[PDB]
């Protein structure tokens, strides 16, 4: 009605927006525009003052630096990194041969959320997540086990995060300010993959520095301790060594378990290569026997592109069709060997 038409000229038109400093029990509001300003605003309604909290942005009318009403904008650079999204088209069934290993991590993350009936009647409740890692280059393949968790509720894919090493925030509350904004939109999962904080030997380049940078990484160490860790906000860590975390951090969590990704054997190589070629039809002239037999202890990704490097040179001969000229050139890549290497060298 006439409400919106009457009060639109009170705040604007060219109004400025500052930041709320503190809240007084006398109803006087102190707003700070950038930079170094104060004011007294008395408003008894439209608040919503509890959801605000200090250190937030509020409107300021031109006459005179007063707030017509408060809104929730942005909020903060950290909340934006959750989207988007992920929830891809991939599922946990798209990989195989790890079914015995994946049933431990899949059932642990599916214990909350779906099937809550036996979760609430228990009233203990291990919502600790897991910790992932493995050779030679894996540990993001264990993230492919979380692609089913990515499709479950809200997911956050994180490698090295952002604010950890680059520039610090204020306290552990950054994850906890994510927890309070998630509690409306919950559940959620926050992944951790390949931490580069301690992974780098020589940091780039010379900084403030060889000592203190360890102390601002120690800020991350206490940020994950944490005060006070209660709910989820699931935490799944992936990195080389877990020993970077102090035993004082394990006391709040997470004490559940950590798994390692073993080298997939010939039964797993053929299964991983089969499901990728299941939905999207393969070629009949290329046999899967000589591919898995000629290799020993290799991932599912490595068996894939050795057939691509054959199709790589194939287009130089200008063949989109399946041609037997590549069959020998692919068998030549089997005779080329070189798939695996590792020391050794000794006779034992």
């Amino acid at each position: 009605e006439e409400e919106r038409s009457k009060v639109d000229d009170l705040r604007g038109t060219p109004m400025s927006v500052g930041t709320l400093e503190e809240i007084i029990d006398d109803n006087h509001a102190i707003v700070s525009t950038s930079v170094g300003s104060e004011h007294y605003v008395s408003i008894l309604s439209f608040v919503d003052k509890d959801l605000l909290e200090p250190g937030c942005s509020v409107l300021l009318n031109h006459k005179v630096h007063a707030v017509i009403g408060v809104l929730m904008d942005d909020t903060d650079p950290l909340v934006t990194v959750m989207k988007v999204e992920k929830a891809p088209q991939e599922t946990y069934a798209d990989i195989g041969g790890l079914d015995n290993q994946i049933q431990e991590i899949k059932e642990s993350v599916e214990l909350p959320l779906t099937h809550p009936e036996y979760y609430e009647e228990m009233g203990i409740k291990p919502p600790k997540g897991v910790i992932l890692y493995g050779p030679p280059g894996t540990g993001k393949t264990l993230l492919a086990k979380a692609v089913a968790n990515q499709t479950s509720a809200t997911f956050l894919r994180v490698v090295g995060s952002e604010l950890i090493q680059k520039y610090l925030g204020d306290g552990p509350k950054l994850v906890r300010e994510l927890f309070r904004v998630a509690e409306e939109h919950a559940p959620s999962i926050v992944f951790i993959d390949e931490i580069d904080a301690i992974g780098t030997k020589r940091y780039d380049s010379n900084s403030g520095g060889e000592r203190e940078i360890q102390r601002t990484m120690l800020e991350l160490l206490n940020q994950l301790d944490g005060f006070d860790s209660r709910g989820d906000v699931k935490v799944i860590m992936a990195t080389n060594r877990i020993e970077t975390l102090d035993p004082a951090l394990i006391r709040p969590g997470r004490i559940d378990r950590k798994i390692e990704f073993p080298l997939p054997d010939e039964k797993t190589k053929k299964r991983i290569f089969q499901i990728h070629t299941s939905r999207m039809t393969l070629a009949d002239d290329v046999t899967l026997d000589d591919l898995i037999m000629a290799k020993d202890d290799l991932s599912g990704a490595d068996i894939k592109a050795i057939c691509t490097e054959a199709g790589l040179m194939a287009l130089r001969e200008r063949r989109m069709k399946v041609t037997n000229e590549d069959f020998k050139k692919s068998k030549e890549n089997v005779l080329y060997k070189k798939q695996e290497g590792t020391p050794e060298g000794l006779y034992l």
């Binding site: 009936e117 609430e120 039809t281 009949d284 001969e317 200008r318 063949r319 989109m320 069709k321 399946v322």
Partner: protein, 694 residues
């Protein structure tokens, strides 16, 4: 020619055979092979563009298929005079099939960009104008069968070429997953109608001739089938032995064995809770106390005799659920009671529904497969005795539920005699009346019914009933995709759009989230009140994530209407599976200070969302529900509705004996639930007990 083997890469070697054609035919392929066989030479696959034409006109096969894998383009248009085209093609159709499956017995090809893309690219010109019956029938490939058909009414596509049960199993399976995206599915034998002997004969011969392994889909079909029309037509189509299959048919031993199986997996408490309510005698609500003993006992007469004896007081509408329990008790197996069931009808001028209209509904609703065929002609004759006193309004709602349910294609037409009283012209009462009155008469399907009834009813037009009248045409065609074409009008009444998306789309996947979300944001205000009503159909797929999420914001609204449609949207489709979010939400709901039945409609209806017909023995304990109904009834204090809620959660809670689930896994739709549940939205007085029958 020597030009094909030239080291120069200059274009082009294609189409060169069109300028000079008959003269190069004197040569053979002997000159072509040294160019393509020798490697490290120019124009390897480029020479195949000229070679594909030479091997096509020579009728040689498997050579053209191998050389056309590179082209993928010139295969479509290739040398045009149609006489050589359709000649060599039919020779290629029979010549490619003989080159495949020669092992014999597969291995299957080996969809693909070689064999499937070549036969599809030529299939374009095939399905356009000339000839017929391409390689899809000859080769028997089920992958090309998806691309074999063209856009047409699927009602004539139910027939197929007969073959062995081996290939028929893969043909029916891959066609089923093809028809889930299509309006019609192989499971349409339920809905269709049809009604010809075809589906009855083809349905009984799928298990032929084995009579042992056929226990499934036959013996399990007749016991889970509520209507007699399924056990009727199939009786003449069941050739086992002679005439003595009536024992398992008629739903006598069928319903009798599954009812004892429910007592096995049961059972419901009888003496404890009910006789404790007898010490409390009759509650002051006179609302949900009638339907209590209905489903419970079943079969016992003494509790049935107390019902019939008390309801002779005639007070209000209380007789509704009780007299419904008179027939339902004996009719749990067969037949039954249909003789004395219709006696109180003419023995009690009604003059309203709450007096003599109850027992008139009994024979109609408790029928469940009758017809038989005396009940049909009896109900139609019984309504001819009471006309002016019914009249056009209150009892005209329940009567169609006794015909279209059992038989959708029934030849007896009850619409003509029931439409003569329309002259009352009242726009208000006719809304909730004529809604399901003309809809539940029959399933229609002839498309001629909507045209007839509209001309005689409108005449003119009613300016109101024409809203719901067009919804009957939308409900007539089931998931036929014509509904998205009928929403272009979008009248200000807005009742068309909500009923169009719900019933107009029946499919496994939702697919309606784009249309459902569009009408709420673009629609006018007060339309969002009736928007959640569509959640009772398309949400049967994933009731967990979609329901409670969107309904969490609408459940806390202070407006009574949108708060009433919120919990209702969850309703039965949300009560099929339990959850911890539905249990944790129960808190703070009963602590609200809001008045009116909407406050307790939220909480108490959600109390039955923990299970449907499950327990209590076996399994979930009843002590949890008894403590919740006792503590919440101490407030207000009366407020007689606190005695309505404690008897409400035990309506479906303590009845049991029916596990639904869905109803049903066969994907039917209960017409008693969707009918009554639309009335509580403009709730006034007695529209609440009409829904209490369920």
């Amino acid at each position: 020619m020597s030009m094909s083997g030239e080291v120069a890469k200059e274009w082009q070697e294609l189409d060169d055979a069109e300028k000079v054609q008959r003269e190069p035919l004197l040569t053979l392929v002997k000159e072509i092979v040294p160019y393509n066989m020798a490697h490290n030479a120019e124009h390897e696959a480029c020479d195949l563009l000229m070679e594909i034409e030479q091997v096509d006109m020579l009728e040689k096969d498997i050579d053209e298929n191998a050389y056309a894998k590179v082209c993928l383009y010139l295969t479509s248009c290739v040398n045009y005079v149609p006489e050589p085209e359709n000649s060599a093609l039919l020779r290629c159709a029979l010549g490619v099939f003989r080159k495949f499956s020669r092992f014999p017995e597969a291995l299957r090809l080996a969809l693909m960009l070689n064999d499937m893309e070549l036969v599809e690219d030529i299939f374009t010109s095939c399905k356009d104008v000339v000839v017929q019956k391409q390689m899809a029938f000859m080769l028997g490939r089920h992958g090309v069968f998806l691309e074999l058909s063209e856009d047409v009414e699927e009602y004539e596509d139910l027939t197929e070429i007969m073959s062995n049960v081996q290939l028929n199993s893969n043909f029916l399976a891959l066609a089923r997953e093809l028809d889930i995206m299509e309006p019609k599915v192989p499971d349409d034998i339920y809905k269709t109608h049809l009604e010809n002997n075809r589906f009855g004969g083809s349905g009984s011969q799928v298990d032929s001739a084995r009579m042992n392994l056929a226990s499934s889909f036959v013996n399990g079909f007749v016991n889970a089938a509520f209507g007699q029309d399924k056990l009727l037509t199939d009786d003449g189509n069941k050739w086992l032995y002679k005439n003595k299959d009536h024992g398992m048919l008629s739903a006598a031993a069928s319903l009798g064995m599954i009812l004892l199986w429910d007592v096995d997996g049961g059972l419901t408490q009888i003496d404890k809770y009910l006789y404790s309510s007898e010490d409390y005698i009759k509650s002051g609500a006179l609302l949900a106390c009638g339907i209590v003993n209905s489903g419970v006992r079943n079969e016992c007469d003494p509790a049935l005799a107390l019902l019939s004896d008390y309801v002779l007081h005639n007070s209000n509408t209380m007789r509704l659920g009780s007299i419904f329990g008179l027939g339902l008790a004996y009719a749990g197996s067969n037949r039954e009671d249909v003789l004395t069931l219709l006696l109180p009808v003419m023995g009690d001028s009604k003059s309203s529904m709450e007096v003599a209209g109850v027992t008139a509904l009994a024979c109609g609703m408790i029928a469940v497969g009758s017809c038989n065929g005396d009940v049909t002609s009896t109900i139609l004759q019984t309504i001819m005795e009471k006309s002016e006193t019914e009249l056009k309004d209150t009892y005209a709602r329940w009567l169609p539920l006794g015909l279209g349910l059992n038989h959708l294609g029934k030849g007896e037409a009850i619409e003509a005699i029931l439409a003569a009283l329309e002259v009352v012209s009242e726009p208000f009462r006719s809304f909730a009346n004529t809604l399901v009155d003309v809809c539940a008469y029959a399933g229609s399907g002839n498309v001629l019914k909507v045209q007839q009834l509209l001309h005689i009813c409108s005449e003119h037009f009613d300016s109101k009933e024409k809203e719901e009248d067009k919804d009957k045409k939308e409900k007539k065609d089931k998931d036929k995709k014509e509904a998205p074409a009928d929403m272009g009008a979008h009248q200000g009444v807005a009742v068309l759009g909500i009923a169009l998306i719900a019933m107009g789309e029946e499919i496994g996947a939702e697919m309606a989230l784009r249309t459902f979300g569009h009408l709420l944001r673009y629609g006018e205000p007060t339309l969002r009140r009736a928007v959640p009503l569509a959640l009772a159909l398309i949400s049967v797929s994933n009731p967990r994530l979609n329901i409670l999420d969107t309904l969490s914001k609408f459940s806390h609204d202070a407006d009574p209407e949108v708060s009433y449609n919120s919990i209702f949207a969850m309703g039965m489709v949300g009560s099929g599976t339990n959850n911890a979010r539905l249990a944790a939400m129960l808190r703070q709901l009963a602590q609200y200070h809001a008045k009116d039945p909407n406050n307790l409609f939220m909480v108490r209806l959600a109390q039955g969302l923990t299970h449907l017909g499950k327990g209590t023995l076996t399994l979930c304990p009843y002590h949890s529900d008894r403590q919740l109904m006792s503590q919440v009834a101490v407030a207000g204090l009366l407020t007689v509705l606190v005695s309505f809620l404690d008897v409400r959660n035990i309506i479906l809670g303590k009845s049991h004996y029916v596990l639904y689930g869905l109803v049903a896994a066969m994907q039917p739709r209960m017409l008693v639930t969707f009918d009554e549940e639309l009335r509580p939205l403009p709730v006034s007085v007695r529209v609440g007990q009409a829904v209490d029958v369920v």
